[PDB]
Amino acid sequence: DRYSFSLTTFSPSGKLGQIDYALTAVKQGVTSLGIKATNGVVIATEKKSSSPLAMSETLSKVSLLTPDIGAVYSGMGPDYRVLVDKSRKVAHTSYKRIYGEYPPTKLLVSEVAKIMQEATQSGGVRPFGVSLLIAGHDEFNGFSLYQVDPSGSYFPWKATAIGKGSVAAKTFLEKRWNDELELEDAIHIALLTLKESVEGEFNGDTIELAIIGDENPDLLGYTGIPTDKGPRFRKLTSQEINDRLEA
Amino acid sequence: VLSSAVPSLPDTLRQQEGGAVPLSTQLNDRHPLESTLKNWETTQRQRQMEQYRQIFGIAEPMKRTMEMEIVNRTDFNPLSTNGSIHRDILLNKECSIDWEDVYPGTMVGDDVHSKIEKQLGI
Amino acid sequence: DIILGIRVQDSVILASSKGISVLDDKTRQLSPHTLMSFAGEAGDTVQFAEYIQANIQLYSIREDYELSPQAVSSFVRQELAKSIRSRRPYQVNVLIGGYDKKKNKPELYQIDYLGTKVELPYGAHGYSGFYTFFLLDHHYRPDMTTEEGLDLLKLCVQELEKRMVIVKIVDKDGIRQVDDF
Amino acid sequence: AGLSFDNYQRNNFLAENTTIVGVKFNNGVVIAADTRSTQGPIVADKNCAKLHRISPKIWCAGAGTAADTEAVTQLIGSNIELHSLYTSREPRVVSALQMLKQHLFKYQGHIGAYLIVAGVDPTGSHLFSIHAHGSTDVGYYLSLGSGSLAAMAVLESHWKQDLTKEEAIKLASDAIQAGIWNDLGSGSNVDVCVMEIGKDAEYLRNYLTPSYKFPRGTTAVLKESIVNI
Amino acid sequence: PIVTGTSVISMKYDNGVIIAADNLGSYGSLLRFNGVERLIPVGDNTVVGISGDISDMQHIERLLKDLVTENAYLEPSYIFEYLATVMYQRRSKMNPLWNAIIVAGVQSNGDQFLRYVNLLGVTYSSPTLATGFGAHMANPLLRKVVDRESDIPKTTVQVAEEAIVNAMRVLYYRDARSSRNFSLAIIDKNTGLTFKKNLQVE
Amino acid sequence: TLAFRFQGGIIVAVDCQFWETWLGSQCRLHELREKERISVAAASKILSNLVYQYKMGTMICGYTRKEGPTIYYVDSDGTRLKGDIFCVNLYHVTEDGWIYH
Amino acid sequence: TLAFRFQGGIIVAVDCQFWETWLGSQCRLHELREKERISVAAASKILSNLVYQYKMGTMICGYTRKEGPTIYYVDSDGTRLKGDIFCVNLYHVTEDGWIYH
Amino acid sequence: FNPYGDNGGTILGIAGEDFAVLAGDTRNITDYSINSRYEPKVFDCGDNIVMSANGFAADGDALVKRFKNSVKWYHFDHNDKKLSINSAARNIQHLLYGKRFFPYYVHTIIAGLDEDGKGAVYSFDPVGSYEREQCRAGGAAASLIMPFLDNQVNLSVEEVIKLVRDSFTSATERHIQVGDGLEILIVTKDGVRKEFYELKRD
Amino acid sequence: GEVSLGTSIMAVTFKDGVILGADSRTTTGAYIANRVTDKLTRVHDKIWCCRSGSAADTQAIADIVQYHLELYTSQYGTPSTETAASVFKELCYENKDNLTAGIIVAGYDDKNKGEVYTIPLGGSVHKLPYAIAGSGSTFIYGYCDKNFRENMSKEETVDFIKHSLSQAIKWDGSSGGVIRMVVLTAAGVERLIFYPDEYEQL
Amino acid sequence: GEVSLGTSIMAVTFKDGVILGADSRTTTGAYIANRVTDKLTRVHDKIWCCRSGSAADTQAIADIVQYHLELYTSQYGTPSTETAASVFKELCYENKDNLTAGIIVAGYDDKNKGEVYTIPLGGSVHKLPYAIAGSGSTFIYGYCDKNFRENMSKEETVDFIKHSLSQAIKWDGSSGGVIRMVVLTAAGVERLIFYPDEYEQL
Amino acid sequence: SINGGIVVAMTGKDCVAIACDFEKIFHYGHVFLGITGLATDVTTLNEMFRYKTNLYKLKEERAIEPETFTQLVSSSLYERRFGPYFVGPVVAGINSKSGKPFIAGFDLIGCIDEAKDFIVSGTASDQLFGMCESLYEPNLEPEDLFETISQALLNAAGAVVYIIKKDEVVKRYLK
């Protein structure tokens, strides 16, 4: 019992078995997309619930890792929930408590990918069955949008979609993206693209949208010391989304 | 690691510690807080298990320790000293920080094969 | 327990003072073109010197290359500091003298018991560290040659024994023993 | 891992050879402190910020070994932030007190952090003081630092039940002024923070604030050089 | 020291000086003797307030009583210099009197007097003086009334008396070695030495 | 006690008990694993490295096919030094072993 | 600082303040009572007996009709010793007094 | 028992070409608590002599007290003749030196005019040793004062008083024991003049 | 520099319950850090603890006991006062070499009605009809014995505790302030507070 | 190895005299060297002393006081209790650095009737209506205050002292044995002894 | 001995000046660090910060800014809180983006003394605190800044002075 044989191994074709199966779980998962605008980033997804009696407020798929970074997933929620808890913890141990500031998006994505990768060679744990669209803002790199897969490979994307409607949505984002997009325009595009992918009812309750954009001092919780400015990640309320839809 | 040539001496070279200068008998003058702080987490965990044994019976500590051993022994990553993600959940340290996490802390004996042998006691 | 070091224009001159009577104390050959001389506590200082010799020798065998004196000096400094971490400091003083074949220039380094490294034209420790600087500083020059250096060392040693050594030279020809102090 | 004791013996061998006050009022709590930092008798750095932020509505101010107070306070701030994110709730002041005191008790007081923790939570306002050994107490008003005795006199003399927001700020500021004048360790300006149950915390930095140009070329230069980044 | 009196506080106002002290002699942590008077009038124009070792205080008291006796065959400064010499000399003899003394009084010319002297012979004057624990609690409070010499003429008897009494209440609340009973002496150039006994802190 | 080296061999004239007794145990193991008698330099080196780890003015003498006659003194502090002459019942040491004189 | 004796006299090149100042007082009294300058041996002896009673590397030099050129060093512990050569702005000492060079 | 205390503060003496200056702060201190804000740390002993003993106040006040008594005795014995600065210096040395094995912990300075009229300043080691110096400072913030002056001096009695003001103003800025008031005594053939200036209160 | 709990605490069983009383003053040396402290700590709804000795070790132990009892409560229902004392002993005793803890445990249970357990610094457990601890308890040992009676009513016990702690407060200055009392009875937990104006004159 | 007086002593003024009471047990460590000691020492016919602290210094002082009072008596008649206390203070205070003496003085005189003077280890003198000292007195401070009344009769005072010292004996083992009491009154000196069987059950 | 050198840092107008009395002033990109104390600790810290900053540059593809480096040094120093490094470091540099001159000074265990005027460390600092304050003014020119920093260092006490511009650094030696 000193050891445990690896769950993930190469097939005769050179492909990793569990990795490809994990990607399939993401593919069968609910759709989620992100769009990188000139002055912000948008991450959106739609909530499928077991019964209407479920409280939609508790079905938070988009989550905050740092005040300037946010993530959304498609696949197994429990794996994403565990990853976010570790991602937030890692953002404090590795970077903040050492450098006194929150890590940039690329570094945080790399450390999340490292967590997902170490599960790809282990005798006890299967690879995480989720792909995370991590959106954030950095003082130097600016706005960014990353997609990290179960294999631990993360790629920066101008606009991307994952899940059941990935191919249909990604092609739709292909025809409706440009370097001159405004955050308000991106939200309109994101809501559109999500409308074709969503099966059934489409409103602000079945949809949650978060944006990385201008600061929100009202969300900081305190005043004074202007060098410490608010957060950038904002999760639009169901009220705001409904107003956007009618427009 | 004891010397292969003589199984009664520390292997001064393979045990990279700054020569044989840090001899065994001299690691006795210690900071008063070193011993207590080094194994503080262990004492709390064992004390916690004792209370479970007293109240919930021997079954609960057996289930807790068996799960941890399953996680620890099935996790071998010679390229990372970070604790396993599932280890934090069982220890209930998934939303806590400590100096041991912030400060986790050679050409000869830091290779992967050294940990493979120690992991399997080969 | 006196150790001396002089960095002449093409070599480094290391000198050392010698119940049990014999007819190479306080020195170790780390490399063909590097020599290490140490002084301090008996016992605690030789194991460190032996350990350093093994590591440097291990590197030479592994790479089949001659580690530069500057790299060797740095390695000693880290190991000495790393040694003191978990114990009470011990009186040790190391002189690393070597010829850098890549740069074709001699080099001499001084390492104190606390693990601080100095590149020196000349250096000393022990009873030689109280007056001998008064002589070397007045007479030492950069372009001094080997044969001149041993006159200075023979001169210097003479003052040492008035108020009161085996000599080795490191050059492009390698370590060399000398009877002419 | 953690603090290492890597050079305790070596350092032993080598050796061988402020005012802070908290005032709880009717609808919140007020924390104030001076801004003088001293490296011994010297005033190392004036205009210093001593009011740390554990969370948006939980603020901390400490004395004793400065680094220890900063180290633990930041560490607890991360745990509060992580715990709040984990539980999706506004953090409680009692939460910070438990981990803060448990952490200090773990180090047997070697971490010399004496702190005053004030904040507002969904259950109301709170005000606690913490010692290096982990012992804590709760009071309507508190004082800390070398000028604590002078500040406490003002607090005891003037403090009363259900103080107003304006009165508490004046009382806390006046108490700090007493320490500034009468204690050497305290001086410079006054930093005031006001935390209220139904409002965002107001950090009133600098709330109260009580030629030799040599001709160019005077200093001789041996040589000059340009460094490249 | 074994039996100690905790604190004395005083302040000079426009027309005189006020000095107060609590009537307690503490035996370590025990509030044993709650009847110890520690203000010593030395005439119609001065009072000596003493803290520290009560046994040494009673030795000071007789010297003051001898001082009136030997002279009668005094000024506040007159009395202080006698005490300061004794306190200094006892220090020089390596046999100190474990006391801190405030001499409060009004000179025959109307000049107000407040001088402090301790076991070490260290002496200083101030608009407000306090000993021991009162140096950190009352002195900041009293200084707010008279921060400088210019404030002395601007402070009346009532204001000075109110500040002194208020300082005692704060002093009593936070001083463990204090008592609710205290004595207060007012020396005025016009009305002379007024001496109030066993006042209650409330 | 004293001992010296000469062309014909070595002359010896006149806690510590066990360490020498225990060392006799290790040399037996070395004499077995390598099937050849442990050299004096090794034996002194083993003893030197031990007294150091457990900070006993022990001495070592021997005569080996390759090493020849050698004398090594081990100070109680771990100092190891070779010696032609050592001074601090006569014995004579040859390749066949010691002889009691 | 140093000083030495030679045929032509003495050469000198480069709490304690008072003791030397006070000693200058005693020599004045001795210069008066006996009406003749105090000898170096006496002056050094007086100083030696004092530093001893009150346990200051003072030195003494002089030139006298009978004593001639002599140098005496007085250690802080009371050790008094004569010296031809002493070593630890030039002055020259003659019978007429010192000369500032 | 510890017979020696501390009071902090700083003193400064400058020997002008003709005039002499002695300056010091007025603040009296004990372990971070301000005993008083105005205690005269510099004294005038007459005969164009100004004296100041920094450090332990009880040692300093005694030394000046005995020195002043010696001056009076000197007047009686020498037909009330003026006491020269050099004569006073050696007199103080004997006073300081008279307690070697139990010495004053005071770095005292006396300033005045030597016989010819030039400025004179003598600084005394606690065990008595003294040396004539052009300028000298002693106390807590002495190290912060001398370097600044040396830049600007190494000058009348109105432009040095500027530098001393700035020098003490700089010291009070970065040093906590430096006082909240500056005393300056000016010695000239005209006589002795006292000037006071205010400093930071905290 | 550890904070020791200067206390005057008392627990008294009576006819149909138990009463736990304590002062409100905590002192660091002669200074009163806080005068409104709540020394009555709740380890369970009907079990209340009071601490003596070091304030850090006891506070840590009290949290663990509450944790263990809450763990026990979820499994075997509300614990007894005897069980809580047993928990305290394990922590207090096995850590006696490192933790300086002295405890008084008073609780109510249906099986045993009111009970009081006192745990001196040694770690021993003694069940008593009534218990007194703290620095101020040394001054009422002879008063509680003379006046205590078995099966007293609530009014008598409240008056008995008031008189007992008034004297301990009077003589011990480490103890004082408001007398906070907890009445544990089948009816439920009841809190009482008595200010100095209510008990001093008794 | 000096013998310290482990005592539980008490003096109480009453209507027409004063009563001095003490235990009879003297202990060296845990051992009882003697259990029938007479701790009530006579310095004069109507003045009786009781000793606390070192048994050697106090015994020497008591002999001197009796010598001085006998010297005084032969000249100015029978002394007062105040005079005897004054004699004790001179010896106790001026020798406080060498003698460790604590005294209680109770006497009767026509001018002042009964009086009690207590002299703690510090050497101070305090006149009180009643006084308690010794190791066992710490346990009855809160009982004597609650029960003591002014101008009590002999029976009440005797009962009051019996109850007070019974508790001190009960809680303090350094004090015990027979309760010997001296009643000083104009009628004359009266001796009383109470055995343990007479007061323990109270 | 080479231990106990004095280092001083001053803030000017769009420029900073750091000077010291083997070199005790080291730079990691555009941020300069001066360390005073034990020479062994000075050598060790440089290697540690070179190790940390080099990884920071590689991982982030960006040079470490002085503000970020200030926290890194403080966190590193607090590690070994028991048995710290016998060193007082000083950091001086200019933020690449904002261009605001920045200086800071630390104790043994990393207490950030982010003074806006000047920073000193090492032996004989007590003399240099007052001299800097007497001479220092706000918003000095780079040439005027050199005179003030050099005069304070020389008179307080060879010596070396670094004048740090945005894209230019000047290294000077003094008599």
UniProtKB/Swiss-Prot annotation, chain D:
Q: Keywords on this record? A: Cytoplasm, Hydrolase, Nucleus, Protease, Proteasome, Threonine protease, Zymogen
InterPro entries linked: Ntn_hydrolases_N, Pept_T1A_subB, Proteasome_bsu_C, Proteasome_bsu_CS, Proteasome_sua/b, Proteasome_suB-type
The residues annotated as the active site are: 18
Q: Its GO CC terms?
A: cytosol; nucleus; proteasome complex; proteasome core complex, beta-subunit complex; proteasome storage granule
Q: Which Gene3D superfamilies match?
A: Glutamine Phosphoribosylpyrophosphate, subunit 1, domain 1
Q: Where are its TM segments located?
A: none
The molecular function terms in GO held by this entry are: endopeptidase activity; threonine-type endopeptidase activity
Question: Does this entry carry the keyword Protease?
Answer: yes
* Coiled-coil residue spans: none
Task: Identify the EC number(s).
Answer: 3.4.25.1
Q: Where in the cell is it found?
A: Cytoplasm; Nucleus
Its chief place of residence is cytoplasm
Task: Name the catalysed reactions.
Answer: Cleavage of peptide bonds with very broad specificity
Q: What else is known?
A: The side chain of Thr-18 acts as a nucleophile, and the N-terminal amino group acts as a proton acceptor.
What role does it play?
The proteasome degrades poly-ubiquitinated proteins in the cytoplasm and in the nucleus. It is essential for the regulated turnover of proteins and for the removal of misfolded proteins. The proteasome is a multicatalytic proteinase complex that is characterized by its ability to cleave peptides with Arg, Phe, Tyr, Leu, and Glu adjacent to the leaving group at neutral or slightly basic pH. It has an ATP-dependent proteolytic activity.
Q: Which family does it belong to?
A: Belongs to the peptidase T1B family.
The protein in question is named Proteasome subunit beta type-2
Which organism is this entry from?
Answer: Saccharomyces cerevisiae (strain ATCC 204508 / S288c)
Recite the lineage of the species. Answer: Eukaryota, Fungi, Dikarya, Ascomycota, Saccharomycotina
From Swiss-Prot, chain E:
Of which family is this protein a member? Belongs to the peptidase T1B family.
Q: Name one GO biological process term.
A: proteasome-mediated ubiquitin-dependent protein catabolic process
Say which residues of the entire protein are included here: 37 to 248 of 266
- Assembly with partners or alone: The 26S proteasome consists of a 20S proteasome core and two 19S regulatory subunits. The 20S proteasome core is composed of 28 subunits that are arranged in four stacked rings, resulting in a barrel-shaped structure. The two end rings are each formed by seven alpha subunits, and the two central rings are each formed by seven beta subunits. The catalytic chamber with the active sites is on the inside of the barrel. Interacts with CIC1.
Please identify the protein, giving its name as recorded: Proteasome subunit beta type-7
Domain of life (superkingdom): Eukaryota
What keywords were assigned to this record?
Cytoplasm, Nucleus, Proteasome
* Role noted for this protein: Non-catalytic component of the proteasome which degrades poly-ubiquitinated proteins in the cytoplasm and in the nucleus. It is essential for the regulated turnover of proteins and for the removal of misfolded proteins. The proteasome is a multicatalytic proteinase complex that is characterized by its ability to cleave peptides with Arg, Phe, Tyr, Leu, and Glu adjacent to the leaving group at neutral or slightly basic pH. It has an ATP-dependent proteolytic activity. PRE3 and PRE4 are necessary for the peptidyl-glutamyl-peptide-hydrolyzing activity.
Give the chief site where it resides.
Answer: cytoplasm
Other comments? Present with 16900 molecules/cell in log phase SD medium.
Keyword check for NAD: no
Q: Does the record's keyword annotation contain Transport?
A: no
Swiss-Prot record, chains I, J:
Q: What class of enzyme is it?
A: hydrolase
Q: Does the keyword Cytoplasm apply?
A: yes
The family database entries (Gene3D superfamilies) matched by this protein are listed as: Glutamine Phosphoribosylpyrophosphate, subunit 1, domain 1 (3.60.20.10)
What PROSITE patterns does the database record attribute to this sequence? PROTEASOME_BETA_1, PROTEASOME_BETA_2
Catalytic residues at 7
Where in the cell? Cytoplasm; Nucleus
Its signal peptide is none
Q: What is its main location?
A: cytoplasm
- What InterPro entries is this protein classified in? Ntn_hydrolases_N (IPR029055), Pept_T1A_subB (IPR000243), Proteasome_bsu_CS (IPR016050), Proteasome_sua/b (IPR001353), Proteasome_suB-type (IPR023333)
SUPFAM superfamilies, per this entry? Answer: N-terminal nucleophile aminohydrolases (Ntn hydrolases)
EC annotation? 3.4.25.1
Pfam families, A to Z: Proteasome
Tagged with keyword Hydrolase: yes
In its UniProt record, which GO terms are filed under biological process? proteasomal ubiquitin-independent protein catabolic process; proteasome-mediated ubiquitin-dependent protein catabolic process
Write down the chemical reaction(s) this protein catalyses.
Cleavage of peptide bonds with very broad specificity
A Gene Ontology term for the protein's cellular component:
proteasome storage granule
The GO molecular function terms of this record are: endopeptidase activity; threonine-type endopeptidase activity
Keywords of the record, alphabetical order, are: Acetylation, Cytoplasm, Hydrolase, Nucleus, Protease, Proteasome, Threonine protease, Zymogen
Additional record remark: The side chain of Thr-7 acts as a nucleophile, and the N-terminal amino group acts as a proton acceptor.
Similarity remark: Belongs to the peptidase T1B family.
Q: What is this protein called?
A: Proteasome subunit beta type-1
Native organism:
Saccharomyces cerevisiae (strain ATCC 204508 / S288c) (Baker's yeast)
UniProtKB/Swiss-Prot annotation, chain K:
Mind listing the GO biological process terms from this record?
proteasomal ubiquitin-independent protein catabolic process; proteasome-mediated ubiquitin-dependent protein catabolic process
Q: Main site of residence?
A: cytoplasm
Single GO term (MF): endopeptidase activator activity
* Covalent link location (Glycyl lysine isopeptide (Lys-Gly) (interchain with G-Cter in ubiquitin)): 52
Please give the SUPFAM superfamilies that the UniProt record associates with this protein: N-terminal nucleophile aminohydrolases (Ntn hydrolases)
Domain of life of the native organism? Eukaryota
Note the InterPro entries from the entry. Answer: Ntn_hydrolases_N (IPR029055), Proteasome_beta_3 (IPR033811), Proteasome_bsu_CS (IPR016050), Proteasome_sua/b (IPR001353), Proteasome_suB-type (IPR023333)
Gene Ontology cellular component list: cytosol; nucleus; proteasome complex; proteasome core complex, beta-subunit complex
Keywords per UniProt:
Cytoplasm, Isopeptide bond, Nucleus, Phosphoprotein, Proteasome, Ubl conjugation
Taken from the record, one Pfam family name reads Proteasome
| Compartments, record wording | Cytoplasm; Nucleus
Q: How does it assemble?
A: The 26S proteasome consists of a 20S proteasome core and two 19S regulatory subunits. The 20S proteasome core is composed of 28 subunits that are arranged in four stacked rings, resulting in a barrel-shaped structure. The two end rings are each formed by seven alpha subunits, and the two central rings are each formed by seven beta subunits. The catalytic chamber with the active sites is on the inside of the barrel.
Protein name per Swiss-Prot or TrEMBL: Proteasome subunit beta type-3
User: Which species expresses this protein natively?
Assistant: Saccharomyces cerevisiae (strain ATCC 204508 / S288c)
Q: What is the lineage of its organism?
A: Eukaryota, Fungi, Dikarya, Ascomycota, Saccharomycotina
